[PDB]
Amino acid sequence: QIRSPISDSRFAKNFIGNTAFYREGLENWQRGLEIGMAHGYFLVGPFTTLGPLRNTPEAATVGLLSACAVIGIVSVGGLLFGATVKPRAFDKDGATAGSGFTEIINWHAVGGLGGAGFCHLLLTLF
Amino acid sequence: AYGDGPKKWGAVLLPLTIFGVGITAMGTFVLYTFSEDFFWAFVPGSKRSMELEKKKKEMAEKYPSPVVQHPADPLAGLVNRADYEKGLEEAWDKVKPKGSTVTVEEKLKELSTQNNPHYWRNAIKS
Amino acid sequence: YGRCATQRYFQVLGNIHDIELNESLNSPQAIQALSFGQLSVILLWLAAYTFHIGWSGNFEAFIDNPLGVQPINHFVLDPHYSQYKVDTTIAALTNHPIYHWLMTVGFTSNAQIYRFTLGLEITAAVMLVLSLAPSVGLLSMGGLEVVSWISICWAGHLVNFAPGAANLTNVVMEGPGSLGNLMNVLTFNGGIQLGTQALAVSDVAHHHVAIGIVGLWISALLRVSKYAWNFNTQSSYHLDLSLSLTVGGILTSLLAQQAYVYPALSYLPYDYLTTTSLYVHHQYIGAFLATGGFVHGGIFLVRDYTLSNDLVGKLLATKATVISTLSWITLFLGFHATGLYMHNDAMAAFGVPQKQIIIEPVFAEFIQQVFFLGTPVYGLGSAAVSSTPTLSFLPIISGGDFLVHHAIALGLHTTVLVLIKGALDSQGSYLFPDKQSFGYGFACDGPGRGGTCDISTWDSFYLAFFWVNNTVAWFTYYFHWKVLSLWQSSTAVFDENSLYLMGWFRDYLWQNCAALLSGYDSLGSNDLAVWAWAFLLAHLAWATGFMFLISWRGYWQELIDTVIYMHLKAPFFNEIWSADVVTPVALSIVQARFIGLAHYVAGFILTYLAFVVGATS
Amino acid sequence: AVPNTPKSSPDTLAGNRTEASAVSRPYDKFNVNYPLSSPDQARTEVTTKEIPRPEDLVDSPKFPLFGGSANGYMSKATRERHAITWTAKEETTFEMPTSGWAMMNKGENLCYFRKKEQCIALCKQLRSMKINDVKIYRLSKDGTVTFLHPSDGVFPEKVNKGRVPVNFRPFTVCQNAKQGELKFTEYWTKPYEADALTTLFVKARVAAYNDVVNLFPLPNPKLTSGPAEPTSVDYDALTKEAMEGQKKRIEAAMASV
Amino acid sequence: AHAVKIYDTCIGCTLCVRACPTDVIEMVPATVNAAKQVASTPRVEDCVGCKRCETACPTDFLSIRVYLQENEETQYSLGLDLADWS
Amino acid sequence: YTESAQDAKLFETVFSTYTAEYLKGPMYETPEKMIGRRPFNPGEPLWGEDKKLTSNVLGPLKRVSSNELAFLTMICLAIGAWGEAQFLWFDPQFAAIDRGEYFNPIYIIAASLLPVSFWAHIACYIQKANGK
Numbered sequence A: 001q002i003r004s005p006i007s008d009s010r011f012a013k014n015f016i017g018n019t020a021f022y023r024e025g026l027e028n029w030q031r032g033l034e035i036g037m038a039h040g041y042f043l044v045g046p047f048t049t050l051g052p053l054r055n056t057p058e059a060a061t062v063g064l065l066s067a068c069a070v071i072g073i074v075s076v077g078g079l080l081f082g083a084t085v086k087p088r089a090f091d092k093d094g095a096t097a098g099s100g101f102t103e104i105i106n107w108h109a110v111g112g113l114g115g116a117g118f119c120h121l122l123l124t125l126f
Numbered sequence B: 001a002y003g004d005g006p007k008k009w010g011a012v013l014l015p016l017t018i019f020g021v022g023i024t025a026m027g028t029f030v031l032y033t034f035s036e037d038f039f040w041a042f043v044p045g046s047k048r049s050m051e052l053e054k055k056k057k058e059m060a061e062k063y064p065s066p067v068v069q070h071p072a073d074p075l076a077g078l079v080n081r082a083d084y085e086k087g088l089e090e091a092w093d094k095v096k097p098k099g100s101t102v103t104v105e106e107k108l109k110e111l112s113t114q115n116n117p118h119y120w121r122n123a124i125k126s
Numbered sequence C: 001y002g003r004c005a006t007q008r009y010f011q012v013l014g015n016i017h018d019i020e021l022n023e024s025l026n027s028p029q030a031i032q033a034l035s036f037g038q039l040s041v042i043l044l045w046l047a048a049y050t051f052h053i054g055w056s057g058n059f060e061a062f063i064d065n066p067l068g069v070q071p072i073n074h075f076v077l078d079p080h081y082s083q084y085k086v087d088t089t090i091a092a093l094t095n096h097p098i099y100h101w102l103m104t105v106g107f108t109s110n111a112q113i114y115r116f117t118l119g120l121e122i123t124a125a126v127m128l129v130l131s132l133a134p135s136v137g138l139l140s141m142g143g144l145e146v147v148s149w150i151s152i153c154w155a156g157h158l159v160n161f162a163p164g165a166a167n168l169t170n171v172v173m174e175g176p177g178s179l180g181n182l183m184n185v186l187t188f189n190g191g192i193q194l195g196t197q198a199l200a201v202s203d204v205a206h207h208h209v210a211i212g213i214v215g216l217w218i219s220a221l222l223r224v225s226k227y228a229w230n231f232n233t234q235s236s237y238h239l240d241l242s243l244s245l246t247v248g249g250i251l252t253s254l255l256a257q258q259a260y261v262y263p264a265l266s267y268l269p270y271d272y273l274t275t276t277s278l279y280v281h282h283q284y285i286g287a288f289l290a291t292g293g294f295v296h297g298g299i300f301l302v303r304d305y306t307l308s309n310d311l312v313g314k315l316l317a318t319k320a321t322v323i324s325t326l327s328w329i330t331l332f333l334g335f336h337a338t339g340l341y342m343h344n345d346a347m348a349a350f351g352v353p354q355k356q357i358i359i360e361p362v363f364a365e366f367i368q369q370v371f372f373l374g375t376p377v378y379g380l381g382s383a384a385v386s387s388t389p390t391l392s393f394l395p396i397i398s399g400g401d402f403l404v405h406h407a408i409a410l411g412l413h414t415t416v417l418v419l420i421k422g423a424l425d426s427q428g429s430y431l432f433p434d435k436q437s438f439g440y441g442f443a444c445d446g447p448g449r450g451g452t453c454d455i456s457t458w459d460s461f462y463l464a465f466f467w468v469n470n471t472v473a474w475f476t477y478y479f480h481w482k483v484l485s486l487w488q489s490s491t492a493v494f495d496e497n498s499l500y501l502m503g504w505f506r507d508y509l510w511q512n513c514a515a516l517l518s519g520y521d522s523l524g525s526n527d528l529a530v531w532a533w534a535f536l537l538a539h540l541a542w543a544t545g546f547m548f549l550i551s552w553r554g555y556w557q558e559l560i561d562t563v564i565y566m567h568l569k570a571p572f573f574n575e576i577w578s579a580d581v582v583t584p585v586a587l588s589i590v591q592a593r594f595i596g597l598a599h600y601v602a603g604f605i606l607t608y609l610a611f612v613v614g615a616t617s
Numbered sequence D: 001a002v003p004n005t006p007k008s009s010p011d012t013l014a015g016n017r018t019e020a021s022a023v024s025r026p027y028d029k030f031n032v033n034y035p036l037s038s039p040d041q042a043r044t045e046v047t048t049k050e051i052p053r054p055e056d057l058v059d060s061p062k063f064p065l066f067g068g069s070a071n072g073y074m075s076k077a078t079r080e081r082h083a084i085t086w087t088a089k090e091e092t093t094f095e096m097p098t099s100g101w102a103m104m105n106k107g108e109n110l111c112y113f114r115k116k117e118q119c120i121a122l123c124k125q126l127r128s129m130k131i132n133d134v135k136i137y138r139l140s141k142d143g144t145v146t147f148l149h150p151s152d153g154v155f156p157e158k159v160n161k162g163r164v165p166v167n168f169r170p171f172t173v174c175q176n177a178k179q180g181e182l183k184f185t186e187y188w189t190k191p192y193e194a195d196a197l198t199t200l201f202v203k204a205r206v207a208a209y210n211d212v213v214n215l216f217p218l219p220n221p222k223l224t225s226g227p228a229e230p231t232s233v234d235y236d237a238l239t240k241e242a243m244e245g246q247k248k249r250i251e252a253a254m255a256s257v
Numbered sequence E: 001a002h003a004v005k006i007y008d009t010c011i012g013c014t015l016c017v018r019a020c021p022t023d024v025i026e027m028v029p030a031t032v033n034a035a036k037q038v039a040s041t042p043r044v045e046d047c048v049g050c051k052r053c054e055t056a057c058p059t060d061f062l063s064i065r066v067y068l069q070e071n072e073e074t075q076y077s078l079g080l081d082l083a084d085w086s
Numbered sequence F: 001y002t003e004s005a006q007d008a009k010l011f012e013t014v015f016s017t018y019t020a021e022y023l024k025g026p027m028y029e030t031p032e033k034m035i036g037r038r039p040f041n042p043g044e045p046l047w048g049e050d051k052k053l054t055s056n057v058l059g060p061l062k063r064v065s066s067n068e069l070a071f072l073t074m075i076c077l078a079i080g081a082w083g084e085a086q087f088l089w090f091d092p093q094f095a096a097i098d099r100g101e102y103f104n105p106i107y108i109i110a111a112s113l114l115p116v117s118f119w120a121h122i123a124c125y126i127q128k129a130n131g132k
Ligand code: CLA
Pocket: B006, B008, B009, B010, B011, B013, B014, B015, B017, B018, C040, C041, C042, C044, C045, C047, C048, C049, C051, C074, C075, C076, C077
């Protein structure tokens, strides 16, 4: 609970607090979708270039496939975490332990696929 | 050709055998960590182990074995523990220091009793 | 659930097969079932090798030209290869004598190999079925009679597939016939038969039938010796396990020696790499089995022995004498071997190689000349030349072999010293009088009484395993350099440069690493690239073992505590991970020592395997 | 703050810490009288009103002059707390068990820690500075307060009445039974937990085994469904002569001592 | 919970009590030594296993013995500071 | 009566001695004492208070007289020595194999009797020392 400007200034409180993982008014699926879109759009990057098939016409497609694979693997890991730990930090009233976190991870997988596809689209075009 | 064979079978199985099998093994081992029977035989006082011990005791007391078994209580081997103590009593009275007020049964109770509440089988309210 | 620590993993996994502590399957029937499952695993491993040899392999091309073809183990399909490396590599070559064994035992086709794989899988299924139903009835299976019967059946197989079996007249139908008729399949020629440069299949079959019959007789004699004087006073799974492990280690080391000197597989000596790998592998296995015999003897002392006036009681009472005399032997051997090697190093360095102390191994030379050699090589003890000598691959010793054998004796005696000292002090030392109540393995007794690090009986094995690996490294360096000199026809570079240890560096290690390091470089990569990569990987594992052995827990526990603080204070993750589930704690002291030893020996084995492959390729 | 500390409550982040500790670690339990040694030992009871949980105290007057540090307990990640309640004679500086320095209040003082070891270290430091009445409490997840350290009011360094000995073994350390002697019993791997009677019995049993001149053969069981084997040895005569031998041996042994 | 035991050889030093960083050892009256007091361990659940009590025992061998039980580790025995299992 | 610590030690010694002398007899009934584990076999004590082997240590031939066992071991020794000498040195049998002819079974059967003679003379002395 120590106070530091990096972790207790108003910018930090309203920045981490307004992220998808913490933003008020967001359903679990919205948080998952937003985090997934961010992760998927990021992950296409380091694969299309800096990869085995760099200097090939299908570099963007291979990067997209690898980014989707990484999103799927981390989503399986998140499902594993929700099945084992059941974080319970996002569950609504009643429901079951870890339902909110599992929904977040599933929609993170969906958003990761979406963001990876969007990055691949923006690479093939323009 | 020579390459064909292991090429197609490999393309089918090696992804399976390494990726799918190893990842499934890792995930199932993580689940087994959070399972109720996680190393049940090696965790003292575990529910499965205690139920197994209780059922072993029930089977032993319901189906007596004609062959003699190693006594769980070393004194339980005696065919007539009464005669054991009676002899002790006679021998002790033979070699008692003068008119000692100490009797054999009190000494046996004192030696058998022990205050070790922190030992398991005692922390399980047993 | 799972509100344990990561220490739970390494605590239970270290005893996961300590079935005596597993009250569920504690009965001996369960242990026999474990043996059945292990044999099923062995059968499936052999099925793996046979299946990949018959699937993508040149055994049909190997039987035709066993000298001119290199055996193929399996097809390589690594996706990480570059087209060139794909064009470069044909398939994973063979580093084991399974082609030679299959050729010897009568395999002449890939169809026979496929049937062998099917039979191995079916036998593994049979073993699993037997393990499904543990039972005192199945405890009857086994015994020296059973293994002798297995030997007799193997003799029958070898008779059926001996090269001269075609000329054999059916004995069971047309009678025994002339002696030569039996000599078609049963011989005692003795030694290498020339051509195949290995023992005749007739010799092996005759050996096995004789061994089986003698084993049946010996088992019957031992059981009548159990008729009168029937005393099973000390029964323990660890006592019998120690007996089995020591006998198996002796047999495996003897197998290495007598398989190098009397190869039984056709055209094996022509393959240098497989011969060297065979010897090194079997010597490591034998040393491991002997160490396990000592370890289980110590365990039997720890938790299954009751003090008496018996053999073990007498050993324990005078354990101080045993430890002191073993310490004297080790001190003498180490002092003198190291001092003579350093003296030779100084003499060779100072340009005066003549002034080295070269004590001729006259006793081993006397034994060799009088008992083994058929021609006068040294002339001491005897000088008679055999009219009809037999052939083998017994090396001719020289001055350096004296020092090397003294190093071997030092290593063996030091390993035995550590193991015996730990086992006998499991009953207690004056620093730890009550070790009989602390179990085989424990961290320490704390900083009190001056310190008690590595005072456990398990720590005795932990310390002695370094010595096991060191001794095996010493005599495997000896064997490898001897056979490399013999194959390269030097035989004088060894006999002169093995006197001083700089020779052991320059001419053995530095010299034989030239091709291995060129496995891959800027120019390209060849078939030895995998072995250079494994060389580096093994060095990395060895140094990670150094990490786990040198640095101890407390530091790492504090560091892991700070890392947990970082995780619990990290954003987006404190909502998800509270460190309550599988709490990350530093490895316990015993677990850390074992894992460091495991990395050390894994790097040891992989480094020496890569070096052997790169040197004898 | 959400970036400084997790937004969810400590109970929410704990999940099922209970009902899983009872499963993950069924051995981890306290005895019926944890802070004390005997059931009839007063057992002073305190509640949250006396020593409240730290999350319910903000700027309490009983807190010492402490500036906060990263080395304190994990709020919202751990729920167990240990509290010290000591009374000062003057305002002086002391070392916190979690490093850093705090200054004691003139009168009552109160600190919160995660581990009891920190509280005991602070108690040792304070008693070295001539401070009595250092009381150490434990705060549970639900707020139940357990009074520790001077549990019976008298510090453990000083012997006090009403304290029953616990884990006292009436012999020397090396007079424990050996593991081989306690084999197949519940005390096989833990011979230090065996009774004095059991240890003496097994130590006599091993000696009895080593006297095969008088050891009894213990005839074979009759398991086969067929008729009893006629054999050639009378078990009744052997049992009678063994009774006579046992009687005479016991007489001679008691004459010796 | 590392089991801690007290034996007859204890002579009522109280050094083991003062050496314990978690208040495990405790001084009970007894009639076996001249000090008329003997150590006891009624709070073994707090024993971390540091064996400081064994470092402070003056007898020929340890009148107080700490038997480490690695298969029964506890957050109190493991000295956990950032993880709670209660 | 203000029991002494030495009196407590005396009781411990008495208990240990009584137990030790009591568990030997047929009143403890433990698996160790089962025939063929620790005991001496019912009616066949191998040795008495003095560590002298009884005739029961011979097994089936526990009542063959000392003279008969001496004759047996001497005949076995003579026949085995004759077979060994006739197999190794005088009319060697391996050299006969080199001649293409089979072994002589008489020599092998004779030479098989030397360890028989060894154990037979050991049993003969056991019988002689027991007066059999
Ligand atoms: C020790 C056992 C063993 C090992 C290590 C290997 C290793 C390999 N095999 Mg293989 N194989 C084996 C036995 C084994 N084989 C047997 C017995 C068969 C006959 C059914 C086959 C049939 C087979 C085929 C058809 C193919 C391989 C292939 C491969 C390669 C890629 C891995 C893979 O896809 O495996 C797949 C293997 C299987 C599906 C068969 C199951 C393996 C056996 C039956 C299990 C043995 C388990 C053993 C007892 C250890 C258990 C304990 C373990 C948990 C530690 C790799 C070199 C592939 C290859 O070369 O591509 C490059 C390939 O296409 N193998």
